[PDB]
Write a protein that binds this ligand. Sequence first.
Ligand SMILES: *[C@@H]1O[C@H](CO)[C@@H](O[C@@H]2O[C@H](CO)[C@@H](O[C@@H]3O[C@H](CO[C@H]4O[C@H](CO)[C@@H](O)[C@H](O)[C@@H]4O)[C@@H](O)[C@H](O[C@H]4O[C@H](CO)[C@@H](O)[C@H](O)[C@@H]4O)[C@@H]3O)[C@H](O)[C@H]2NC(C)=O)[C@H](O)[C@H]1NC(C)=O
Ligand SMILES: *[C@@H]1O[C@H](CO)[C@@H](O[C@@H]2O[C@H](CO)[C@@H](O[C@@H]3O[C@H](CO[C@H]4O[C@H](CO)[C@@H](O)[C@H](O)[C@@H]4O)[C@@H](O)[C@H](O[C@H]4O[C@H](CO)[C@@H](O)[C@H](O)[C@@H]4O)[C@@H]3O)[C@H](O)[C@H]2NC(C)=O)[C@H](O)[C@H]1NC(C)=O
Ligand SMILES: *[C@@H]1O[C@H](CO)[C@@H](O[C@@H]2O[C@H](CO)[C@@H](O[C@@H]3O[C@H](CO)[C@@H](O)[C@H](O[C@H]4O[C@H](CO)[C@@H](O)[C@H](O)[C@@H]4O)[C@@H]3O)[C@H](O)[C@H]2NC(C)=O)[C@H](O)[C@H]1NC(C)=O
Ligand SMILES: *[C@@H]1O[C@H](CO[C@@H]2O[C@@H](C)[C@@H](O)[C@@H](O)[C@@H]2O)[C@@H](O[C@@H]2O[C@H](CO)[C@@H](O)[C@H](O)[C@H]2NC(C)=O)[C@H](O)[C@H]1NC(C)=O
Ligand SMILES: *[C@@H]1O[C@H](CO)[C@@H](O[C@@H]2O[C@H](CO)[C@@H](O)[C@H](O)[C@H]2NC(C)=O)[C@H](O)[C@H]1NC(C)=O
Ligand code: NAG
Ligand code: NAG
Lengths: 175, 303, 304
Amino acid sequence: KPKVSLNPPWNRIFKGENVTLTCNGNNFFEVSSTKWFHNGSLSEETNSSLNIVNAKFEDSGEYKCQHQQVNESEPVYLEVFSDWLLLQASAEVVMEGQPLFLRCHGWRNWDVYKVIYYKDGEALKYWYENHNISITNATVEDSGTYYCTGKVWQLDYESEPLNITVIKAPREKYW
Amino acid sequence: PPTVKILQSSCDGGGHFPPTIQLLCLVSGYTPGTIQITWLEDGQVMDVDASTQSELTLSQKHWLSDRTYTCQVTYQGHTFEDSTKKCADSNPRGVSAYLSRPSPFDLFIRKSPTITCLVVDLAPSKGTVQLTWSRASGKPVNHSTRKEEKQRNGTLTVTSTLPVGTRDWIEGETYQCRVTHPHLPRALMRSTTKTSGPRAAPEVYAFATPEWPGSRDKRTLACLIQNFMPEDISVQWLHNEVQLPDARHSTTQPRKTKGSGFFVFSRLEVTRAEWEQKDEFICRAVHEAASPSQTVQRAVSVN
Amino acid sequence: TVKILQSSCDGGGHFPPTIQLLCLVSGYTPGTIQITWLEDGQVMDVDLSTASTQSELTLSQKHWLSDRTYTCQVTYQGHTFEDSTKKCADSNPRGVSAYLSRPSPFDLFIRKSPTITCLVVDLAPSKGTVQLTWSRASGKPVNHSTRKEEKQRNGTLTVTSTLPVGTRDWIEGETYQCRVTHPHLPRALMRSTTKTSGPRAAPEVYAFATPEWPGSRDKRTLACLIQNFMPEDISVQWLHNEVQLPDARHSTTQPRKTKGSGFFVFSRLEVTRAEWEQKDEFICRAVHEAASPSQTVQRAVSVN
Ligand SMILES: *[C@@H]1O[C@H](CO)[C@@H](O[C@@H]2O[C@H](CO)[C@@H](O[C@@H]3O[C@H](CO[C@H]4O[C@H](CO)[C@@H](O)[C@H](O)[C@@H]4O)[C@@H](O)[C@H](O[C@H]4O[C@H](CO)[C@@H](O)[C@H](O)[C@@H]4O)[C@@H]3O)[C@H](O)[C@H]2NC(C)=O)[C@H](O)[C@H]1NC(C)=O
Ligand SMILES: *[C@@H]1O[C@H](CO)[C@@H](O[C@@H]2O[C@H](CO)[C@@H](O[C@@H]3O[C@H](CO[C@H]4O[C@H](CO)[C@@H](O)[C@H](O)[C@@H]4O)[C@@H](O)[C@H](O[C@H]4O[C@H](CO)[C@@H](O)[C@H](O)[C@@H]4O)[C@@H]3O)[C@H](O)[C@H]2NC(C)=O)[C@H](O)[C@H]1NC(C)=O
Ligand SMILES: *[C@@H]1O[C@H](CO)[C@@H](O[C@@H]2O[C@H](CO)[C@@H](O[C@@H]3O[C@H](CO)[C@@H](O)[C@H](O[C@H]4O[C@H](CO)[C@@H](O)[C@H](O)[C@@H]4O)[C@@H]3O)[C@H](O)[C@H]2NC(C)=O)[C@H](O)[C@H]1NC(C)=O
Ligand SMILES: *[C@@H]1O[C@H](CO[C@@H]2O[C@@H](C)[C@@H](O)[C@@H](O)[C@@H]2O)[C@@H](O[C@@H]2O[C@H](CO)[C@@H](O)[C@H](O)[C@H]2NC(C)=O)[C@H](O)[C@H]1NC(C)=O
Ligand SMILES: *[C@@H]1O[C@H](CO)[C@@H](O[C@@H]2O[C@H](CO)[C@@H](O)[C@H](O)[C@H]2NC(C)=O)[C@H](O)[C@H]1NC(C)=O
Ligand SMILES: *[C@@H]1O[C@H](CO)[C@@H](O)[C@H](O)[C@H]1NC(C)=O
Ligand SMILES: *[C@@H]1O[C@H](CO)[C@@H](O)[C@H](O)[C@H]1NC(C)=O
């Protein structure tokens, strides 16, 4: 089962941004063997890299890839937003292992000041300029609703809530 | 048309503002026939302070509050102006939108309500904000007048005035102003509706303070209007049943009283010329509950 | 007396091209007066005069953009006077705000315990302390400070510092300086306060009672207009049988300019029938600096 990765990460993007979806897979049968599927449809891309430029509102949805035969690939949900502030996360089904990344992206590359992250009511971190959250090896308690409030063009704006779950250990056991 | 410049006391040491800042407005190279300098504070009025120098003394808080001061010279032909302000490196304020309810005077007396949508803190370059008027019920709207003004600090101001049917507004129709800009991600949404809730007739008390022995020239007439709901109220002053200009009197913004309602204060200054005439000075308040004709008035005079 | 003047920032706060610097040297005995200009300890201009400087510093938008210090020096008859200039530093570095309040007339003259509060807001938590210092421009001993830290919910810090000052020192026109040297802030936060200068006018107070409404025969309203006072600061109080009423019992509007020179304020108080029917006298008192000698002017309200 090939896994589709987005370059850059944070599928939550703004309108007019850039993404590139690619499923590597164990094999390297890129030539005329990668089928890219939007919502229950067939696209017109044969290369392993599907580049979305100027991402309109119609480009959102679930994406799948079908490198040669296999069975299928795990669908990836791409959502396009048009707010002043958007909270972008590296993953939302993140394991207890690989770290968790949070970014407060303003509209375009506009500087955002007085950025405050929230932790379901309780504020997490406040910084004078735009800052990232780089929680390495997030544990169980790092879950819930996250949103960032900032100051763009000397005016206060608030992002949209994002639900992040980290889940528990898979098996443990070991008697 | 002389040369007008403004000089500001620069910071001392490692860039520290002096506790008192002295702005110096220089007007040089003119034929002296009439000299008049005004010191507007963001469009307001300030007291008083070849070549002429005008001195303005300002505190730390006033200068650091990011206020624009306009030194304006009147030279018969025109009214030239300069500008001075604390200068910020970058990050200008973003576009702001405001919506104003119709005044009771234009709603019940003149029977011609007009709602105003104001767009401020615009940008001189690439600014073409489109203002759209909509109704909650979807009924067609009347033609609106849109005007653009250049402010003293360089930003643009867009004013959109649309007349509103009195019957439509009285019933409770909700109007909406949409501001669209190419750079803005979303569209600025503003909504104006009626002020639903309890209604109480305003209580108006007009009075004359007694004459201070220092000045036998002017008298201060005043009028307290209390216990009215909602807060939308118009205040006017009538001299021999003739409405005085709005610049003659000053009315305090509505404030919620402790008990149940709102209260406002109106103050006006009269010269001894009208006081000798023994005319009846009328304080009038127009409010939605000021039955019967949406108006309550009181009269004061000598003795 | 040597003073300095830069070129004012135009409109919304953009530096005009060809910045001009003026050095005003005045109030001296005529003689061998020599004025020099220094750039970061170097030589920039040398002037001789027997009147302010006859040559003005013309720059470009290359020097007045970074950390450059320009010094105007007078070396007149062996007497050396120095003045330093630099692009004015940010009032709120990194967005951290500083507000320096002023003592009210009430505790400046009646309570005789004036206090000045320096409030630093929009700070961030860090491993350390926010170093705040109180100083006087003339240079005199200070009276400590009641420093306090806060932990506001939005993650920002808050530093409050109250310093008690002498009324005599504040009356004469002393300057009080609050300095903040937090490590996050690049250089410092430098706030100054000083008694407002200008003309002084004794306030005129007119206090009265509204006449009885036929609607509800329980509560009456007492109104007090205080006008023609300069400067804009004032304290308004209501007294019943010579004991001060709580501040929540009355509402006072913010000072506003009149048609002429001066301000005006309205104060409204609500009294009950039981208090009123006792025939007590209600005192409206205004405390202002120009109401010499007691700095308080009061008037009386009563029925009939
Ligand atoms: C450059 O200079 C211009 C002016 O020269 C500045 O523009 C001003 O901006 C401020 C704030 O954005 C405006 O203040 C707001 O005014 C609204 C207009 O209502 C008044 O005016 C109308 C007539 O136009 C009257 O009919 C009405 O009765 C009002 O008297 C108010 O409605 C606003 O109040 C709302 O916001 C405040 C908080 O700001 C709340 O406390 C209120 O309750 C209410 O919700 C507000 O007061 C001002 O009007 C603008 N000037 C003009 C002439 O319109 C620019 O800001 C300046 N640039 C910079 C960068 O500073
Ligand atoms: C996180 O949350 C905290 C609290 O929830 C916020 O802290 C508040 O920040 C505001 C904004 O700076 C502070 O309000 C400021 O107060 C200053 C001092 O006020 C004096 O005067 C009043 C009476 O008017 C007294 O009650 C008060 O005790 C002080 O003695 C004002 O100077 C500020 O501006 C005022 O004046 C200017 C002119 O100079 C006007 O233009 C303004 O409109 C305004 O009238 C301002 O009002 C408030 O005190 C703080 N709360 C505290 C310290 O407890 C943080 O800002 C927030 N962080 C973020 C990132 O949002
Ligand atoms: C595959 O499925 C996805 C959904 O999983 C689908 O994306 C959806 O597209 C529709 C548009 O056809 C979105 O619906 C709205 O359309 C209006 C215009 O009619 C837009 O204005 C909406 O965006 C915002 O607009 C305002 C700002 O201008 C906001 O105030 C407002 O609240 C809107 O959020 C929005 O685009 C629908 O939202 C998306 N779905 C999601 C989850 O976002 C996609 O089109 C499908 N693929 C194909 C090829 O059809
Ligand atoms: C916040 O992070 C962004 C991007 O984070 C990158 O991607 C993450 C998944 C993780 O791998 C991070 O370690 C990465 O740095 C930063 O933007 C990058 O800035 C550098 C320096 O200019 C640039 O070379 C990269 O191309 C940028 N990334 C992208 C995707 O464009 C940003 O600097 C960080 N800090 C902030 C925003 O304050
Ligand atoms: C990345 O986004 C930028 C704008 O956000 C776009 O750049 C365009 O790239 C195409 C080629 O893919 C060029 O033809 C255009 O001229 C570019 N526009 C510019 C530079 O304004 C595009 O959406 C993405 N660019 C790439 C290379 O993928
Ligand atoms: C978690 O962080 C990295 C990433 O997995 C890992 O190498 C490290 O050993 C882990 N640390 C702890 C304390 O579990
Ligand atoms: C996020 O998860 C919590 C816990 O299950 C739930 O209560 C909440 O409704 C979720 N939020 C959204 C937007 O789905």
